């Protein structure tokens, strides 16, 4: 992966500008798209500690979620090893992206309920935080409009940032307050996670006791082990892409069963 990315056949947009950075997304478009369409959309979010990364990462999934009739993007946000941010400024990004997203949802042909949140690792975390943690939002942008994705993808997230109840250096605020497990609650938008039981830097028990607990509150929480698997196993060009395609294709059954996507 490489940092500024190569997205091929992309519509760049700018969707945030703060301290002279322009943010890009990277829209992928799907065949026989009008800015009049009503699609479901979904946003990726790249993993890299929330201080390196690319959006490359995710242009295979982007291309395949375009292949499938949905409008698919891959977010570029702030990360330490190059600008002056804290986990915090890399979820007021987040949403700024989600928000953006609604907000020229009619110029994209989007659905503005059916916006997907999706990333891996720091990604997922930050994905996480558009649907399930409140405030950290732009203080000038427009919060009217709702920066919470109306459901969530997560590639190995990181969801449990504080060890209340059960690099804070830069985390930009108390931990609770950017930790996913910490705001579940009853009424969240539905989400899937994948993660591998060998996880050595994201510990798949803390996976595990979020679903549980997302679970007990009555959201659809559904966790996909994926058995003796490392940290990143589902990314393209690992394994035998086995495990990716393994995870594309669940994703796919998961927004086919909530209804936002058509069956193949």
């Given at each position: 992966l490489r940092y500024p990315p190569e997205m091929p056949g992309a519509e760049v947009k700018v969707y945030k500008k703060v301290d002279n950075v322009d943010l890009k997304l990277y829209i992928y478009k799907p065949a026989d798209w009008k800015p009049a369409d009503r699609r479901s959309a979904i946003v990726f979010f790249f993993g890299g500690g929330w201080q390196s990364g690319s959006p490359a990462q995710f242009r295979p999934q982007c291309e395949y979620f375009a292949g499938r009739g949905m409008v698919a993007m891959a977010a570029d946000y702030r990360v330490g090893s190059r600008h002056n941010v804290k986990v915090a400024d890399c979820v007021a990004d987040a949403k700024s992206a989600i928000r953006w997203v609604r907000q020229h949802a009619a110029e994209l042909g989007v659905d503005p309920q059916k916006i997907v949140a999706s990333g891996g690792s720091a990604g997922g975390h930050l994905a996480a935080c558009t649907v399930m943690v409140p405030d950290l939002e732009a203080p000038e942008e427009d919060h009217t409009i709702s920066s919470q994705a109306n459901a969530a993808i997560l590639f190995n997230?990181?969801?449990?940032?504080s060890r209340e109840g059960l690099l804070r250096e830069r985390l930009?605020?108390?931990?609770k307050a950017v930790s996913p497990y910490h705001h579940i609650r009853a009424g969240l938008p539905p989400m899937i996670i994948f993660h591998g039981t060998a996880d050595n830097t994201v510990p798949f028990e803390t996976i595990r006791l979020f679903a549980e607990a997302m679970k007990k509150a009555g959201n659809r929480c559904e966790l996909v082990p994926f058995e003796g698997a490392a940290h990143?196993?589902?990314?393209?060009?690992?394994?035998?892409?086995l495990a990716y395609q393994k995870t594309l294709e669940l994703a796919d059954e998961f927004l086919v069963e909530i209804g936002f996507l058509a069956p193949k």
């Open positions: 997230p990181v969801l449990i940032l930009g605020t108390e931990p990143g196993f589902f990314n393209f060009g690992r394994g035998d892409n």
